[PDB]
Design a protein around this ligand. Sequence first.
Ligand SMILES: O=S(=O)(O)c1cc(Cl)c(O)c(Cl)c1
Ligand SMILES: O=S(=O)(O)c1cc(Cl)c(O)c(Cl)c1
Ligand SMILES: O=S(=O)(O)c1cc(Cl)c(O)c(Cl)c1
Ligand SMILES: O=S(=O)(O)c1cc(Cl)c(O)c(Cl)c1
Lengths: 284, 284, 284, 284
Amino acid sequence: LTFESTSRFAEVDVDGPLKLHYHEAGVGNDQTVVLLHGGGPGAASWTNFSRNIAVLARHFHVLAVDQPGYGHSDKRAEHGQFNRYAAMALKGLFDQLGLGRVPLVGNSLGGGTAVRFALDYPARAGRLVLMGPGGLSINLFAPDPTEGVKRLSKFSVAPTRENLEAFLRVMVYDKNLITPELVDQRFALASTPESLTATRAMGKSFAGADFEAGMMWREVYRLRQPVLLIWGREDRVNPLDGALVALKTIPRAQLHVFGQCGHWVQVEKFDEFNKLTIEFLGGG
Amino acid sequence: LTFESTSRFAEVDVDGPLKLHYHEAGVGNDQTVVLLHGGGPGAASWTNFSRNIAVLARHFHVLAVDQPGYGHSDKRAEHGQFNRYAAMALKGLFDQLGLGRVPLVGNSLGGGTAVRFALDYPARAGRLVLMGPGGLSINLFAPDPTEGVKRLSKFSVAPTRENLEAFLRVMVYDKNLITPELVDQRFALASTPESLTATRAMGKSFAGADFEAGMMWREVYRLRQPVLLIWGREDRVNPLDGALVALKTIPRAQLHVFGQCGHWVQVEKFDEFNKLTIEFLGGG
Amino acid sequence: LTFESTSRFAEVDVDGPLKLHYHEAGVGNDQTVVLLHGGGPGAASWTNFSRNIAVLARHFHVLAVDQPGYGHSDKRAEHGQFNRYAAMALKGLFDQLGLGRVPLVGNSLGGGTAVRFALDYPARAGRLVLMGPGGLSINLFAPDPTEGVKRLSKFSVAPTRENLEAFLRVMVYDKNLITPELVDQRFALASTPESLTATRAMGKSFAGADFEAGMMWREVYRLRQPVLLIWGREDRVNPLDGALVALKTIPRAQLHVFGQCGHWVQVEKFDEFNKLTIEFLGGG
Amino acid sequence: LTFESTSRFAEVDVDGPLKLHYHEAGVGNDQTVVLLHGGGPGAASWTNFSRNIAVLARHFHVLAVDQPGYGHSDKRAEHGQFNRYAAMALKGLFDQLGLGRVPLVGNSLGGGTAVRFALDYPARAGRLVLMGPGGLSINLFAPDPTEGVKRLSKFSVAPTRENLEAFLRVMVYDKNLITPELVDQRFALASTPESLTATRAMGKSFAGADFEAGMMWREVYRLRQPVLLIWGREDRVNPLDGALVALKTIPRAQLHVFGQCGHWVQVEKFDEFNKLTIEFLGGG
Ligand SMILES: O=S(=O)(O)c1cc(Cl)c(O)c(Cl)c1
Ligand SMILES: O=S(=O)(O)c1cc(Cl)c(O)c(Cl)c1
Ligand SMILES: O=S(=O)(O)c1cc(Cl)c(O)c(Cl)c1
Ligand SMILES: O=S(=O)(O)c1cc(Cl)c(O)c(Cl)c1
């Protein structure tokens, strides 16, 4: 299993042609699962889920989608509320691949997209695994913007290696995971003009009239499927108090919290995350 | 595996002879694990863990201990703070069986005992699994006594089948688990004079000068081992807000919450509980 | 100031003629304030605010309204979602009495109506004082129905003195407030066929398709005015964890919590409550 | 009322002579009240309480004490756990000035000292007013160190104007309060060798064996007096989730939360804070 071998492309319609890049593995397996990566600068599916896709592929047919603005998917200068935008792209991909009701795995921004999708196209979404998800979360005690979000913002205004290293270091409990190579690899991807355009586009999308689409905590009580929430206790981007409204209002919810774990649950506690996901999605 | 076949007895010293009853299974297995049952009226190890001991025995050497005042262990009229009292009994049993550092599994009252033990004899306790544990929990939002505790109290003053049925029904989310047979079986065990003496003894123990031993949330920051907290979202005895101090202050803590689950986690979500416990304790 | 001297009536249009009963005092004063009472059986403005109306009249022009289904207001057999229904009644009264933009004081169900009114007629509502309010509250930790709501339902099914007294005793921290005279007076009002008619209507309205109007926590982020939330720490109907979404999302919110105080804040902490309200509404 | 007119000195014994600086006003008034300031760099009584001392003096005999290590009080190179250390200083001052049992007002670190004083000398402390207090607070959701505490540490390691300004900007909701004059005045006080001496002492005292004296949340259940907790919703040093253990376990506690207010409650909400304190201490 390699990046090149699993790579695939599709063109869908979201107010015009939109190129989506994704990775496909475990093709022969019975159950299809869609993975949606995090939203940090330079983030993409393969690197987001490096410790997970191979293991998950043994039990499931995996589709790891680069969300628009990330990876090798189109990076438009303008778009509406992001999760709905990415959901529309995902809705298009579903019809293309002929998928019915499929479980979704999403961390952070991808979590928000997974949920927005499940609300907008209820018949198409199965079980959810959401790790420190945005949108669905609302920080009842943490003043917004959180420290994590501040460091994201500072990078957007001033995209330097130092600001990106600073951002990555508040993503994780074990800061040794932030290696010089990772910073370099991420900075190289994040600093290109196409990626920086995508970053600005996200910022403007917050000022949209469709902002209420972002506040998914208002709507997830409508979700009928099982939902597994996974959180890092030391998450400084979407801290733990953000899980409570969702945990309360989603009828078939579960929550798992890791101590000594940050926002990057799928990396920091990759083994514990994998087994939990496999079991929750039926063991395939 | 049956009740009679696994049954064992030991005599330990807690300010004099104390008969302890327990169940032993999976004798040939590498890792020893101690189970500590819930504190409801008529509660005991076998019935508390009926859906779990057999499955756990395949991976571990299981010791399911009837805590003093319950099952076939001695039911003294007088004792000090209960968790310390039960811990002293357990401390005695450890030395007798020649045990070193052993992981503890305890729900509700047994959870409180497991924790009190881990604090008082730090070298002797390994990993903890605690389901809706007492003592370690403190209800930050729920007014005390909770509805669950009220129904326990009403039974103590007025031990009738109706009050016990009422108590059992707020133990679980799925009330169909409260079958006529269960109520009858529990009432028969709970209503005997020896068991009712034990119930009164518990009540008086709250008035003790050693009450501070009960408030384990003050001390568990001292715990160095991994601790798995498991909660039912609809727990009406020790509600979910009681997990927060422990989750915060125990350095290597985890928390798992089940939606559509009450205080009896090990029964209501018995499969999910078993696999979680097996994985957390090393898969044996 | 007596019930008789302050008594007033008005007829407004909510899908036809609707009689509203209210109490008026401090007629000469500059600033108008509307009080909206709790939703318990036999509840009405006068008994609900007996400890407050006299004091508030010294500073404000007070209007304490019996909400439809309560007091001497019409008790219809049929109505929609209650808070929207009662708000429509209150809007009609505003126009009749010629009121402009007025601050609102509401505890429990009346809190919900106050909030519902403020959302539906934004130009007409000023500062809000809300005591253990329904609707805007959502219990993030307490399993629903709460102990309070359960005992209300039990009385509704079986309207007996014993069940009402049981209901009343979980309304307050200090149970000595629940005197035989109080139980009898509430029971007499609650046991009339007209009040029983209203109970049936309230029950049926829950099955309505407009239920989402009830979930005001989804909407209060839109409130532009200052809002003072007041809670009893030991509130067993609308517990303290229910304040969190509102405190977070209402931009100019405040929260005051009284220790050793239940659901009936305006009674148990009447003096402290009066001063907070008087100061918060400008000292008049 | 000026810094010069109110200035006073006293020498007390805490393991030897210790100079305490304080401000005294309202000398003729019946009820004495002690103010204990925050722990920021350059912090002292006068600047901390500039918006309050004049107003409080109208009703109370006010004593605003520079805690050791701050203001014009002795800045020793060595000391034990700070709150116990400062409390011992305050106890000596009480005896010298002949005070009996006095209410205490303390924000942040001074809140911790107030609480520490109230626990160690129970007969000497009256009603407590605590604004975003240290020590009694424990952040159940916010990962430690908080954003505020981090920026304080960064300044301590690298005491530069840029780092201090960064620290000051997370003290308040309204950042316009952080003016160039403020940054310069605090930086000048913080940059003196004596203050740098005190910083080193504070840093070293954390490594002490008496650290558990710092964790006052474990002990405040023993407080018998009324305690008014005041918090800014947007407090980024001691966030709102930190109030919960204290609100729960202090029997006669109250909590007031201001929306659109940070860590410096007495400055940002100075008028609302003054009235709450004046009323809470009896109106004098
Ligand atoms: O770590 S990531 O999951 O890439 C991430 C995603 C979002 Cl949307 C975000 O705001 C931050 Cl700070 C980090
Ligand atoms: O369900 S049980 O675990 O037996 C249980 C144990 C205790 Cl200590 C308790 O107070 C209640 Cl209400 C129930
Ligand atoms: O005591 S009251 O404020 O009248 C009250 C109102 C409502 Cl809506 C309720 O459900 C309960 Cl339990 C009590
Ligand atoms: O602003 S202050 O209240 O002076 C303050 C005191 C302490 Cl102890 C602290 O750690 C911080 Cl970050 C701020």
